[PDB]
mmCIF file of C-alpha atoms in Angstrom:
data_model
loop_
_atom_site.group_PDB
_atom_site.id
_atom_site.type_symbol
_atom_site.label_atom_id
_atom_site.label_comp_id
_atom_site.label_asym_id
_atom_site.label_seq_id
_atom_site.Cartn_x
_atom_site.Cartn_y
_atom_site.Cartn_z
ATOM 1 C CA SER A 102 -1.233 -10.994 5.951
ATOM 2 C CA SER A 103 -2.342 -8.031 3.797
ATOM 3 C CA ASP A 104 -5.838 -6.768 4.352
ATOM 4 C CA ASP A 105 -6.197 -9.355 7.470
ATOM 5 C CA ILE A 106 -7.722 -7.237 9.984
ATOM 6 C CA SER A 107 -10.278 -4.681 9.877
ATOM 7 C CA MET A 108 -12.254 -2.580 12.079
ATOM 8 C CA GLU A 109 -16.213 -1.823 11.103
ATOM 9 C CA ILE A 110 -17.674 0.593 13.433
ATOM 10 C CA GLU A 111 -21.720 0.412 13.558
ATOM 11 C CA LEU A 112 -23.235 3.709 13.517
ATOM 12 C CA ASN A 113 -27.115 4.129 14.885
ATOM 13 C CA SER A 114 -28.208 3.406 11.270
ATOM 14 C CA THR A 115 -24.993 2.918 9.138
ATOM 15 C CA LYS A 116 -21.290 1.623 9.320
ATOM 16 C CA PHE A 117 -17.975 2.149 7.986
ATOM 17 C CA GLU A 118 -15.705 -0.652 7.308
ATOM 18 C CA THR A 119 -11.998 0.414 7.124
ATOM 19 C CA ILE A 120 -9.034 -2.188 6.950
ATOM 20 C CA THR A 121 -5.277 -2.251 7.636
ATOM 21 C CA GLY A 122 -4.682 -2.735 3.978
ATOM 22 C CA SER A 123 -6.325 0.709 3.620
ATOM 23 C CA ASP A 124 -4.051 1.846 6.457
ATOM 24 C CA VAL A 125 -0.713 0.065 7.494
ATOM 25 C CA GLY A 126 2.207 -0.783 4.982
ATOM 26 C CA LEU A 127 3.969 -2.117 8.261
ATOM 27 C CA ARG A 128 3.299 -5.689 8.673
ATOM 28 C CA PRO A 129 3.996 -7.671 11.644
ATOM 29 C CA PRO A 130 5.420 -11.086 10.566
ATOM 30 C CA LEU A 131 4.514 -14.465 12.092
ATOM 31 C CA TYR A 132 8.016 -15.412 12.419
ATOM 32 C CA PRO A 133 9.303 -14.900 15.431
ATOM 33 C CA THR A 134 7.311 -18.334 15.356
ATOM 34 C CA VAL A 135 8.930 -19.406 18.516
ATOM 35 C CA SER A 136 5.886 -19.508 20.652
ATOM 36 C CA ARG A 137 3.847 -17.102 22.770
ATOM 37 C CA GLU A 138 5.111 -14.052 20.630
ATOM 38 C CA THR A 139 2.123 -11.494 20.323
ATOM 39 C CA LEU A 140 1.625 -8.969 17.562
ATOM 40 C CA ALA A 141 0.261 -5.339 17.085
ATOM 41 C CA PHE A 142 -2.108 -3.716 14.499
ATOM 42 C CA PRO A 143 -2.084 0.182 14.932
ATOM 43 C CA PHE A 144 -4.770 2.466 13.475
ATOM 44 C CA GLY A 145 -3.282 5.886 13.257
ATOM 45 C CA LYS A 146 -5.893 8.342 14.230
ATOM 46 C CA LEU A 147 -9.294 6.775 12.634
ATOM 47 C CA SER A 148 -11.424 9.700 12.115
ATOM 48 C CA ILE A 149 -14.846 8.124 11.783
ATOM 49 C CA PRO B 143 1.735 18.247 4.255
ATOM 50 C CA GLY B 144 -1.247 20.150 3.045
ATOM 51 C CA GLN B 145 -4.049 18.699 0.937
ATOM 52 C CA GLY B 146 -3.025 15.290 -0.615
ATOM 53 C CA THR B 147 -3.171 11.543 -0.484
ATOM 54 C CA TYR B 148 -1.219 8.656 0.600
ATOM 55 C CA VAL B 149 -0.992 5.677 -1.960
ATOM 56 C CA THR B 150 0.881 2.597 -1.388
ATOM 57 C CA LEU B 151 1.427 0.532 -4.732
ATOM 58 C CA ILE B 152 2.075 -3.270 -4.672
ATOM 59 C CA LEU B 153 3.731 -4.242 -7.863
ATOM 60 C CA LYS B 154 4.039 -7.441 -9.764
ATOM 61 C CA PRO B 155 7.328 -9.153 -10.159
ATOM 62 C CA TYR B 156 9.191 -8.965 -13.096
ATOM 63 C CA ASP B 157 7.805 -10.341 -16.290
ATOM 64 C CA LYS B 158 10.188 -10.200 -19.553
ATOM 65 C CA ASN B 159 7.067 -9.402 -21.419
ATOM 66 C CA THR B 160 5.001 -6.528 -19.464
ATOM 67 C CA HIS B 161 8.248 -4.879 -18.446
ATOM 68 C CA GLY B 162 10.295 -4.824 -21.172
ATOM 69 C CA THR B 163 14.037 -5.846 -20.919
ATOM 70 C CA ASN B 164 14.586 -3.075 -17.971
ATOM 71 C CA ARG B 165 14.079 -4.644 -14.509
ATOM 72 C CA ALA B 166 13.555 -1.068 -13.284
ATOM 73 C CA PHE B 167 10.776 1.351 -13.665
ATOM 74 C CA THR B 168 9.565 4.830 -12.877
ATOM 75 C CA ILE B 169 6.245 6.014 -12.112
ATOM 76 C CA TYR B 170 4.558 9.295 -12.517
ATOM 77 C CA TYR B 171 1.471 11.293 -11.625
ATOM 78 C CA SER B 172 -0.498 14.287 -13.116
ATOM 79 C CA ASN B 173 -3.401 16.373 -12.881
ATOM 80 C CA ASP B 174 -4.525 15.526 -15.652
ATOM 81 C CA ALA B 175 -5.845 17.420 -18.430
ATOM 82 C CA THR B 176 -4.283 15.240 -20.713
ATOM 83 C CA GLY B 177 -1.063 16.571 -22.105
ATOM 84 C CA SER B 178 -0.303 18.894 -19.182
ATOM 85 C CA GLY B 179 2.899 17.090 -18.281
ATOM 86 C CA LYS B 180 3.548 14.519 -15.545
ATOM 87 C CA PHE B 181 5.855 14.451 -12.781
ATOM 88 C CA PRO B 182 8.345 11.898 -11.453
ATOM 89 C CA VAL B 183 7.296 10.953 -8.019
ATOM 90 C CA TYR B 184 9.330 8.021 -7.445
ATOM 91 C CA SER B 185 11.787 5.572 -9.422
ATOM 92 C CA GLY B 186 13.104 2.327 -8.362
ATOM 93 C CA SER B 187 14.233 -1.022 -9.411
ATOM 94 C CA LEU B 188 11.220 -3.788 -9.363
ATOM 95 C CA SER B 189 12.143 -7.065 -8.074
ATOM 96 C CA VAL B 190 12.239 -10.865 -9.230
#
């Protein structure tokens, strides 16, 4: 699940697409496969 | 610390061909006006 999630802020005319492959080397695994376990994807101080 | 960048490097698993016989590696950086020397920033054993 490298580069799987990605924030893309739209400005008034432009946009800037970042991605967690460009941010986070910490990778929440789908194992704990046992049901209803939710995950997290922190973006540290996204200076737009 | 100061001006600088983070780089997280994903490396291929071991090949007998392109990695030589040593399964380990070391990885340098420089400035680089080429020939000014290059600093060892990391050393490690690559995996199969």
